[PDB]
Design a protein around this ligand. Structure first.
Ligand code: CLA
Ligand code: CLA
Ligand code: CLA
Ligand code: CLA
Ligand code: CLA
Ligand code: CLA
Ligand code: CLA
Ligand code: LHG
Ligand code: DD6
Ligand code: DD6
Ligand code: PQN
Ligand code: SF4
Lengths: 741, 40, 47, 188, 183, 161
């Protein structure tokens, strides 16, 4: 049966193993003899399966670690709400959202940093924020600072409860592996219980507190006069005054006259003209429908009662001629190995973050967020980066599963075996695809540069010399534009105005606009595809060739991350799947960097801007994307050089912090190249010279210093490279968008 | 505050963070009380 | 200063109002330190 | 089978300990906090809350009548007024010194020094020096303090709700007839 | 039910200082138990040094308000302002003389490991006893305990005078009169 | 005075820089109303700016044609406060630091578990070493004379030439 079964008091509570630093691993528990011990203590900190063999113990450690992480996240939600409560201008922004710059952080006057408390409107001096939390709270219906303070206190209480839960579920009552492996009940409760009831509760909150407050705010009622949420929750007369369908009660729900709730449950679509964002009635209907969908989906898998599915049987039933045994063994793999689950979950989380980035900008969900140009850019770019990082984590943990938890006795003649048996074909064909795609997509840019420099615009791959029109994307956009009448008759507007339709604008600034697709869009989209394909090549090759290869038949024996297998065979450098991830992180970094550059330039040139009373559409850069994005010279001039002005000229102003971070991120990006290009042998010899200098003075340490390991040097170089590049883009985008928008 | 927790607080990273915290606070307070000292 | 007992009375009688109607809930909630905006802004340390 | 003497329909828990190790054990623990927290810590918290509530209710009632010449504030606004003046900073400083020493004692007691839950040894006048009276006086302390918590809560809440000084009673309760028998109307 | 409680605090365990032969060791006042971490002999040396310095300093503070060196430059009854008012060379010479005294008295004994290596070295016994009060061993315990207690009271008292003058801006007894003046 | 620079107190460009910063602050002051925390903070900040400029003028710093203070580091005692006195202060502090580290290492090497003492610092004696390193110039000289500072090289690991 599916049952609760836990062991009591499995681990005592004591600081003795806090004092003992390297207790978790057998080798580290001995104590230090070189400084590599210190690094390995951090490297192997959360490698539970290397520490303990018991899957039960690994699961318990993971469960309590999840609790600790949730405590951290609750403290983070608390910081956001509390800073909005105290050190902010949320009330001023709520009164006047368009002119007030949102700010929820204040520096102290010590060393001249007080200038960073710039003019953000509302009689408030502080650092402008770009996280969209102000718009989030306006959507939620928060109109006072006491609400922010009290939800911050609640978040702190939840963080304390989560720390307590993490301690309790490891030191007092830890579950068993039998409890952990109840995947069917876990799926049922996560679908119906977590997602379904979360959506249902949020739909109720929206219907009862967000629709009335936001409708009154859009009407013009100032926040002081707004009736409080507790009054709105039970005052059915006021809710009938606002939405007439509420006077009918819940009888139109229990009887299936659901059409009576059409006023506050809508399928309007488009964007609200007042706030320039999605209709909150639409969002409430959305969350209600999703609650129903998830509760329906969560009753699929078997439990104590006879009804339900078995994922084992579902997988085993799917086997084809070209797949042999098919999905046999995958249920056991995913029930026994945590790394496989981590790989799948990280992949889907990253793809979801990217999909979130794509959806939020095209369909602004929060009020006055579309006009808040820094918020849109910041959220899109952030979620893109998080998505790429999660995808590479997925690849890494797939490789870890392959190295450690793979077994042919289990996975004989199944899909995993059949994939490993033609990995060579897979990687060779992806290699050809990568070469072809990169050659075409980048050589079109290079051709454009060559012909422009040769003074031959008639020979360009431009919109007027040799057109490469995205006919299929244009067709899909046309279908979406015509959808509200023909293929979605109950929809009163298009899902997103990017496909087509009217120009939504709040005050002078433009919320959303149709985004045209031409030759430059074709080129940059194929560039995106090329970058994604090369990243997939690197990561998939690392995962497939983690067990072994033609170069190293016994690569699994060496481990997951190892420096090499010597200079033999002409050199076996970075053969490890870890090193494959190390290289794929550079490539997802390049991919996401080009994606965010495309987003920034396209939205600045074609979407964001201002519209006058007559209708004079004036964009930030002036539509230069369509004619300058055809060349790498144009990318270097009209995007990087042109928009770096607001960063470099920021000294002596509130964005001077962005200027400093621009320089510092540049410095760290360059500092990374030392680790990336150099090698441990030189550094160990230099440390030997320095150690002689210290020993001459009788102060050479007992913990002998050593150059960093090879894998560690690669990791440090990659981390510094990513930090420097991402910080450079962060400062550049934030300074540019805050200055111009 | 058993001997084990005192030992843990005596560990190298905790001590580094504590001492550099005190040092940074000392420098910042000296800046507040004697600000803009581009000289002696 | 007023040393209590030496150059002044000791315990001094307090000023009081002789009964009164119930203050409205919004009268003291709007001034409370935790359920008022200005109350929250004033419920901070000082130095 | 031992049933809790305060809730005879529930079995004693277990973490409450032997029946009677703590003065006042009437087995009142429906929510089972003793499983999560240690009983010594909980009892130290209990006696701290008891003593603080006693002093708080007595101080509230006293300040409703009498105040020192310098402090011309009512009991409700005394907190804000004396924070502005600076006295509450002094109280926080000194009570914090005392509380740091107290916390050191709780740490030692939990780690196994031997100190009882709330035995600070404060006994100048010699009350309870005889062991025969000590358990009875502990029980009386607990009873009085547990009463004093509700006393102080009622004090503050009724004070703010009514706006009256000592009794914390509405104007109709104080002036009108709370023992009337002739038919009442709509309002008090 | 503490087996070996602190004498000063029966609700805390005995610190290492309580089970020691120092003067005033029969008090056991160490809630933070800094005697366990700090060498007790070094700590007593520092205690007596601070007490001696501050019990000079309190008398200097109270009598500088009233009395002046005749025609001394930069006098002010408020000693806080008088430090800046007075010549810097006076304070420089004073600090130099005290540096000479400390250096010569603690020659080769400036550190925890270096000092108290010799067993005969006692905390605070820098050999300063011209009048030879210590030859009379009957009163030595009285005088040692009295030195310790008066030094402690003087450290506290000097802190009081310093911070009271910071609060008021007036010298010590002027502020005291202002406190004990008419409403 | 020297290098063609002029004292900052009699520097027209320095005065204009002060005036320009003051005008910038007063210009941004227009957004906030009288008595608000932002207004009072800006008033404090402008007072600080004026005090800083007056202090630089009084200290005797030399201002160039750009109108910024230029520090003369050549060893002349007229400009000792620019480098020489801060240099001595840092040298004393850094010597204190290195002597504390070295002396604690000498203690730890004789401990039964020097490798574990390297990570877990014996704080009671570490504080003693840090305090005792205040007199490092005499202690280092004493160790030099006694020959216990520089190990003979015939006793240090050296790579095959
Ligand atoms: C309706 C019941 C229910 C609910 C609400 C949850 C909720 C959760 N489970 Mg799940 N879980 C359930 C039933 C349920 N579980 C059952 C029946 C089993 C046994 C088969 C498990 C076994 C299980 C495991 C093994 C793990 C989780 C974890 C989680 C968390 C997932 C991460 C997340 O998005 O957190 C969202 C968080 C919130 C919405 C905040 C709410 C916090 C509390 C509930 C208030 C989440 C709090 C993970 C974890 O430990 O994370 C902490 C995890 O590793 N659950
Ligand atoms: C989980 C989500 C959720 C929640 C919590 C609620 C809650 C509510 N909805 Mg519903 N509602 C939801 C989703 C939700 N809705 C959705 C998705 C829709 C769209 C289909 C609707 C559509 C809808 C309509 C159209 C209406 C409501 C209404 C109500 C109220 C029903 C009262 C009731 O049935 O009492 C259930 C009672 C019991 C189970 C018995 C126990 C009673 C307890 C002990 C009483 C406690 C009272 C409280 C603590 C003190 C109040 C004191 C007062 C002086 C302030 C309540 C505020 C009505 C309303 O009031 O609208 C404003 C109403 O007309 N809802
Ligand atoms: C759900 C998310 C998740 C989870 C649960 C895990 C879990 C794990 N990963 Mg990780 N991993 C993730 C995401 C995740 N990963 C992602 C997104 C990536 C892609 C980059 C990776 C890539 C990855 C690799 C390549 C490896 C692991 C490994 C591991 C294991 C040990 C990690 C450890 O002990 O680190 C302890 C923690 C640290 C060492 C600290 C890391 C600090 C980073 C590098 C820098 C932080 C910078 C900071 C944010 C900004 C600084 C600002 C500056 C101004 C100061 C563990 C099972 C290892 C493993 O399984 O080996 C067998 C392993 O080799 N992971
Ligand atoms: C601008 C820098 C740069 C360039 C040009 C390349 C090029 C390449 N990388 Mg990448 N790479 C880079 C930086 C770069 N990398 C960095 C910094 C790293 C370290 C993290 C890596 C790490 C890395 C890995 C690990 C992998 C790649 C892969 C590839 C190949 C992708 C296939 C492709 O599109 O080829 C086509 C060639 C181009 C796009 C270059 C321009 C071509 C045009 C058409 C010019 C043609 C000129 C003419 C015909 C010949 C010369 C004329 C005359 C002089 C005779 C290709 C060789 C992947 C691979 O193997 O792919 C199959 C792969 O696995 N790279
Ligand atoms: C150093 C200044 C000082 C002096 C000389 C006095 C002197 C006096 N106070 Mg006291 N008093 C003082 C400060 C002072 N007070 C302060 C700072 C406060 C505020 C807490 C009070 C609060 C206070 C009250 C509320 C009352 C007095 C009263 C008295 C008189 C009664 C004596 C008594 O019962 O002593 C009893 C003293 C003790 C048992 C020892 C307590 C003090 C030691 C040092 C501990 C007495 C003349 C009473 C009065 O006015 O009588 C007419 C009175 O009711 N005083
Ligand atoms: C929970 C305990 C508690 C707290 C937090 C406060 C807090 C306060 N009291 Mg106090 N007060 C208390 C108990 C408490 N009181 C008790 C038990 C009494 C009766 C003796 C008083 C009698 C009292 C008076 C008469 C006055 C205050 C006032 C005040 C304010 C200034 C401090 C002061 O002068 O206190 C003085 C406190 C004492 C003299 C009591 C000292 C003895 C304590 C309880 C320890 C006993 C065991 C040893 C402040 C808001 C002043 C104020 O602002 O009034 C408007 C004021 O005039 N209190
Ligand atoms: C214990 C302290 C200590 C001491 C006395 C020295 C002494 C020396 N180091 Mg340094 N060094 C130290 C720690 C120390 N090092 C550490 C921790 C590292 C690793 C980052 C280095 C890395 C290093 C390099 C790479 C080089 C030197 C060099 C030198 C020489 C020139 C001085 C200099 O420029 O320092 C430079 C100082 C640093 C780079 C940073 C020092 C780190 C901190 C600030 C000090 C450590 C204090 C420690 C925490 C004290 C604990 C004691 C406490 C518990 C009581 C000299 C022999 C140079 C040389 O060979 O010249 C001939 C040289 O090339 N050192
Ligand atoms: C692009 C690559 C297409 C060529 C490689 C696909 C080769 C392939 O994966 O094997 C054929 C395989 C289907 O195989 P079966 O029907 O045997 O497997 C069904 C499985 O779900 C049961 O294990 O996938 C597809 O048909 C995808 C076709 C490309 C769409
Ligand atoms: C017992 C106990 C605990 C407790 C407790 C508690 C809550 C204790 C509370 C004690 C309390 C409440 C003690 C007030 C004293 C007030 C004094 C001395 C006032 C001085 C006032 C002075 C010196 C002057 C006042 C002035 O008006 C004068 C006269 C002149 C005017 O010009 C202005 C000024 C301002 C100058 C622990 C530690 C929490 C846990 C443990 O387990 C059990
Ligand atoms: C135990 C012992 C001995 C002893 C002893 C004794 C008598 C010890 C005495 C210790 C003593 C008497 C210690 C006082 C501390 C006072 C403090 C910290 C005050 C802070 C005050 C502050 C921070 C004030 C702040 C404010 O004013 C500001 C700045 C502005 C206002 O707006 C607000 C307020 C008012 C808040 C012997 C007998 C000597 C020897 C024996 O062997 C051992
Ligand atoms: C610079 C560098 C070093 C030397 C750098 C080291 C050892 C890092 C130093 C870190 C310590 C902890 C200092 C951090 C700052 C404080 C002084 C402490 C390597 O050991 C190395 C090894 C393998 C590949 C590349 C490299 C590499 O590039
Ligand atoms: S440099 Fe690194 S990867 Fe290359 S042979 Fe040497 S150890 Fe292997």
């Amino acid at each position: 049966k599916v049952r609760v079964i836990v062991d009591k008091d499995p681990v005592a509570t004591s600081f003795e193993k806090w004092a003992q630093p390297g207790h978790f691993s057998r080798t580290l528990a001995k104590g230090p003899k070189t400084t590599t011990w210190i690094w390995n203590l951090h490297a192997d900190a959360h490698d539970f399966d290397s520490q303990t063999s018991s899957l039960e113990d690994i699961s318990r450690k993971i469960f309590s670690a999840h609790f600790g992480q949730l405590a951290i996240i609750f403290l983070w939600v608390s910081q956001a709400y509390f800073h909005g409560a105290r050190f902010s201008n949320y009330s001023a922004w709520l009164l006047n959202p368009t002119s007030i710059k949102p700010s929820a952080q204040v520096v102290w006057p010590v060393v001249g940093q007080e200038i960073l408390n710039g003019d953000v409107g509302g009689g408030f001096s502080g650092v402008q924020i770009t996280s969209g939390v102000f718009q989030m709270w306006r959507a939620s219906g928060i109109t006072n600072e006491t609400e922010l303070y009290w939800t911050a206190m609640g978040g702190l209480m939840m963080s304390a409860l989560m720390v307590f839960a993490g301690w309790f579920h490891y030191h007092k009552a830890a579950p068993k592996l039998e409890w952990f492996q109840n995947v069917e009940s876990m799926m049922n409760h996560h679908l119906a219980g977590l997602l379904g009831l979360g959506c249902l509760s949020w739909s109720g909150h929206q219907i009862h507190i967000s629709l009335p407050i936001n409708k009154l705010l859009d009407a013009g009622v100032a926040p002081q006069e707004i009736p409080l949420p507790h009054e709105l929750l039970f005052n059915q007369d006021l809710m009938a005054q606002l939405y007439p369908s509420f006077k009918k009660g819940l009888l139109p729900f229990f009887t299936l006259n659901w059409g009576e709730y059409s006023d506050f449950l809508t399928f309007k679509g488009g964007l609200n003209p007042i706030t320039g964002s999605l209709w909150l009635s639409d969002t409430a209907h959305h969350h209600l429908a999703l609650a129903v969908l998830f509760i329906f989906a969560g009753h699929m898998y078997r439990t104590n009662w006879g009804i339900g599915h078995s994922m084992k049987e579902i997988l085993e039933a799917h086997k084809g001629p070209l797949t042999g045994e098919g999905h046999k063994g995958l249920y056991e793999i995913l029930t026994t190995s945590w790394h496989a689950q981590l790989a799948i979950n990280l992949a889907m989380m990253g793809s979801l973050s990217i999909i979130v980035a794509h959806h939020m900008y095209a369909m602004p969900p929060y009020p006055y967020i579309a006009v808040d140009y820094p918020t849109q850019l910041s959220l899109f770019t952030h979620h893109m980066w998080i998505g790429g990082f999660c995808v590479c984590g997925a690849a890494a943990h797939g490789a870890i599963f392959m190295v450690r938890d793979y077994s042919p006795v289990q996975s004989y003649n199944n899909l995993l075996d059949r994939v490993l048996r033609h990995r060579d074909a897979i990687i060779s064909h992806l290699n050809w695809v990568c070469i072809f795609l990169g050659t075409h997509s980048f050589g079109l840019y290079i051709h454009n540069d060559t012909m422009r420099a040769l003074g031959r615009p008639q020979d360009m791959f431009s919109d007027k010399a040799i057109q490469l029109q995205p006919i299929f994307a244009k067709w899909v956009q046309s279908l979406h534009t015509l959808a509200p009448g023909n293929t979605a008759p109950n929809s009163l507007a298009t899902a997103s105005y990017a496909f087509g339709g009217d120009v939504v604008a709040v005050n002078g600034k433009i919320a959303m606009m149709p985004i045209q697709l031409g030759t430059a869009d074709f080129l940059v989209h194929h560039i995106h595809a090329f970058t994604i394909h090369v990243t997939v090549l690197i990561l998939l090759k690392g995962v497939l060739f983690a067990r072994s290869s033609r170069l190293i038949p016994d690569k699994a024996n060496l481990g997951f991350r190892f420096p090499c297998d010597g200079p033999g065979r002409g050199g076996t450098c970075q053969v490890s799947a870890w090193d494959h991830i190390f290289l794929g992180l550079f490539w997802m970094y390049n991919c996401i960097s080009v994606v965010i550059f495309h987003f920034s330039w396209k939205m600045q040139s074609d979407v964001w801007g201002t519209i006058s009373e007559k209708g004079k559409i004036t964009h930030i850069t002036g539509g230069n994307f369509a004619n300058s994005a055809l060349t790498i010279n144009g990318w270097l001039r009209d995007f990087l050089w042109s928009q770096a002005s607001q960063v470099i000229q920021s000294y002596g102003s509130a964005l001077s912090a962005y200027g400093i971070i621009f320089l510092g991120a540049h410095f760290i990006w360059a500092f990374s190249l030392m680790f990336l290009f150099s090698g441990r042998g030189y550094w160990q010899e230099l440390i030997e010279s320095v150690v002689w200098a210290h020993n001459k003075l009788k102060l050479a340490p007992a913990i002998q210093p050593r150059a960093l390991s090879i894998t560690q040097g690669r990791a440090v170089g990659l981390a510094h490279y990513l930090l420097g590049g991402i910080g450079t883009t962060w400062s550049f985008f934030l300074a540019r968008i805050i200055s111009v928008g | 505050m058993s001997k084990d927790l005192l030992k843990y607080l005596s560990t190298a990273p905790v001590l580094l963070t504590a001492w550099m915290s005190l040092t940074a606070g000392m420098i910042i307070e000296i800046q507040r009380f004697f600000p803009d000292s581009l000289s002696f | 200063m007023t040393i209590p007992g030496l150059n002044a009375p000791g315990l001094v009688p307090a000023t009081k109002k002789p009964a009164g109607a119930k203050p409205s809930f919004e009268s003291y909630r709007d001034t409370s330190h935790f359920w008022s905006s200005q109350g929250i802004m004033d419920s901070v340390p000082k130095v | 089978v031992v049933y809790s003497e305060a809730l005879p329909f529930l079995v004693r828990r277990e973490s409450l300990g032997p029946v009677g190790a703590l003065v006042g054990d009437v087995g009142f623990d429906p929510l089972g906090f003793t499983e999560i927290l240690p009983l010594a810590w909980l009892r130290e918290a209990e006696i701290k809350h008891c003593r603080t509530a006693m002093l708080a209710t007595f101080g509230f009632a006293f300040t409703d009548f009498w105040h020192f010449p310098g402090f011309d504030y009512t009991t409700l606004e005394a907190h804000d007024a004396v924070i502005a003046q600076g006295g509450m900073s002094q109280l926080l400083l000194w009570i914090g010194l005392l509380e740091v020493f107290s916390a050191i004692s709780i740490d030692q007691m939990l780690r196994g020094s031997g100190r009882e839950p709330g035995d600070y040894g404060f006994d100048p006048l010699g009350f309870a020096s005889d062991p025969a009276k000590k358990a009875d006086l502990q029980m009386k302390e607990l009873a009085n303090g547990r009463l004093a918590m509700f006393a102080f809560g009622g004090f503050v809440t009724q004070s703010v709700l009514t706006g009256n000084t000592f009794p914390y009673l509405f104007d109709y309760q104080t002036a009108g007839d709370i023992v009337a028998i002739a038919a009442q109307g709509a309002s008090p | 039910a503490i087996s070996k409680p602190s004498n000063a605090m029966p609700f805390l365990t005995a610190p290492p200082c309580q089970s020691s032969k120092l003067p005033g060791a029969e008090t056991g006042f160490d809630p933070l138990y800094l005697s366990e971490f700090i060498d007790i002999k070094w700590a007593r040396e520092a205690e007596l040094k601070h007490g001696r310095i501050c019990m000079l300093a309190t008398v200097g503070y109270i009598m500088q308000e009233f009395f002046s060196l005749p025609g001394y430059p930069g006098y002010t009854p408020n000693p806080i302002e008088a430090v800046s008012s007075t010549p810097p060379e006076a304070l420089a010479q004073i600090v130099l003389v005290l540096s000479i005294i400390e250096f010569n008295s603690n020659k080769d004994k400036w550190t925890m490991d270096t000092m108290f290596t010799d067993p005969a070295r006692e905390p605070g016994n820098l050999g300063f006893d011209p009048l030879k009060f210590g030859e009379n061993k009957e009163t030595r315990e009285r005088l040692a305990m009295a030195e310790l207690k008066n030094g402690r009271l003087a450290m506290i008292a000097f802190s009081g005078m310093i911070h009271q003058t910071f609060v008021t801006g007036k010298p010590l007894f002027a502020s005291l009169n202002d406190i004990f003046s008419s409403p | 005075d020297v290098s063609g620079l002029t004292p900052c107190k009699d520097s027209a460009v320095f005065k204009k820089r002060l005036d320009g910063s003051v005008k910038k602050l007063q210009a941004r002051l227009a957004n906030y109303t009288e008595g608000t925390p932002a207004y009072l903070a800006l008033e404090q900040q402008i007072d600080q700016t004026k005090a800083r400029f007056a202090k630089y003028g009084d200290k005797g710093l030399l201002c160039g044609a750009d109108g910024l203070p230029h520090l003369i580091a050549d060893g002349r005692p007229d400009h000792a406060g620019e480098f020489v006195i801060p240099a001595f202060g840092f040298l004393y502090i850094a010597g204190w630091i290195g002597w504390a580290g070295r002396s604690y290492l000498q203690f730890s090497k004789k401990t039964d578990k020097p490798n574990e003492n390297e990570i877990i610092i014996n704080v009671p004696v570490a504080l003693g070493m840090m305090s005792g390193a205040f007199l490092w110039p005499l202690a280092a000289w004493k160790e030099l004379i006694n020959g216990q500072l520089l190990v003979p090289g015939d006793e240090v690991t050296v790579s095959p030439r």
